[PDB]
Amino acid sequence: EVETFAFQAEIAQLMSLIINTFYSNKEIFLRELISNSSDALDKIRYESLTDPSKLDSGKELHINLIPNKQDRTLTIVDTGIGMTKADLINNLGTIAKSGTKAFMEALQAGADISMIGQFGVGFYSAYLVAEKVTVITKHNDDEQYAWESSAGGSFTVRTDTGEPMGRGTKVILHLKEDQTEYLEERRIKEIVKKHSQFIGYPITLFVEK
Ligand SMILES: Cc1cc(C(N)=O)c(C(F)(F)F)o1
Incomplete structure (x- = not known):
C-alpha cells in the first residue's frame, strides 16, 4: 500500500530551483545531510539523558557512509531519533515552507x-546530485517507513518491509549519471575532511569489494 502526496507548492519550487540552477559546488549536499544526521543524533542523546530506555532501540550513536557503485547509490545512515510517519509527510520534520521563503529571499x-542549511531545508540539497532520494526511517514512537521522491511535484510514503533498522534514518541517494564521483573513496574522504571535521559522532566510510 503506497500513498502518493503532492509537495506543497513552495517546496516543489525549492526543488526545481535546486535541480535547474547552474551551480557547480554540488559537494555541499554531503555536508548538509551529515549535519542533519548530527542534529538527529543530538536529539536522541538529549532524550536519553533523562530516560535511558530511549536507547533500547540501539545504544550506538554514529553515521555511516555507504557507496555502492553497482547500484549507483550513496547511502547516509545515522542512528539518530528518526522520524514518525507524520514527520515524513510534514517535509521530513522541517519547517520547509517558511525556510524556503527565507532562503529564496536570500x-x-x-x-x-x-x-x-542556514534556512533549515538542507535535506533538499540532495537533489543537486540525486535523481531519486529514498528515506527509510524508524522513530521509537512509530513503525518503519520509506519516503521516496524523484521530484516532479510528488512523493510517496509506504510501510517499509525491508531490513529493520532499530532506530534512525537512512538516506539513499540514487545518483545522477554524471555525479558518480561521489562514490569514490578519495572524493568522499576529501569532502568529509573539508566540511564535517567537527561533527561529534564517528563517521565511517565503508569500502567496496
Ligand atoms: C530534515 C531531516 C532530518 C533527517 C534525519 N533524521 O537524519 C533527515 C534525512 F535523514 F533525511 F536527511 O532530514
Missing part, C-alpha cells in the same frame, strides 16, 4: 545555494 539578495 538568493535574490546575494546568497548562494551553499547556505541552504
Whole structure:
C-alpha cells in the first residue's frame, strides 16, 4: 500500500530551483545531510539523558557512509531519533515552507545555494546530485517507513518491509549519471575532511569489494 502526496507548492519550487540552477559546488549536499544526521543524533542523546530506555532501540550513536557503485547509490545512515510517519509527510520534520521563503529571499539578495542549511531545508540539497532520494526511517514512537521522491511535484510514503533498522534514518541517494564521483573513496574522504571535521559522532566510510 503506497500513498502518493503532492509537495506543497513552495517546496516543489525549492526543488526545481535546486535541480535547474547552474551551480557547480554540488559537494555541499554531503555536508548538509551529515549535519542533519548530527542534529538527529543530538536529539536522541538529549532524550536519553533523562530516560535511558530511549536507547533500547540501539545504544550506538554514529553515521555511516555507504557507496555502492553497482547500484549507483550513496547511502547516509545515522542512528539518530528518526522520524514518525507524520514527520515524513510534514517535509521530513522541517519547517520547509517558511525556510524556503527565507532562503529564496536570500538568493535574490546575494546568497548562494551553499547556505541552504542556514534556512533549515538542507535535506533538499540532495537533489543537486540525486535523481531519486529514498528515506527509510524508524522513530521509537512509530513503525518503519520509506519516503521516496524523484521530484516532479510528488512523493510517496509506504510501510517499509525491508531490513529493520532499530532506530534512525537512512538516506539513499540514487545518483545522477554524471555525479558518480561521489562514490569514490578519495572524493568522499576529501569532502568529509573539508566540511564535517567537527561533527561529534564517528563517521565511517565503508569500502567496496
Ligand atoms: C530534515 C531531516 C532530518 C533527517 C534525519 N533524521 O537524519 C533527515 C534525512 F535523514 F533525511 F536527511 O532530514
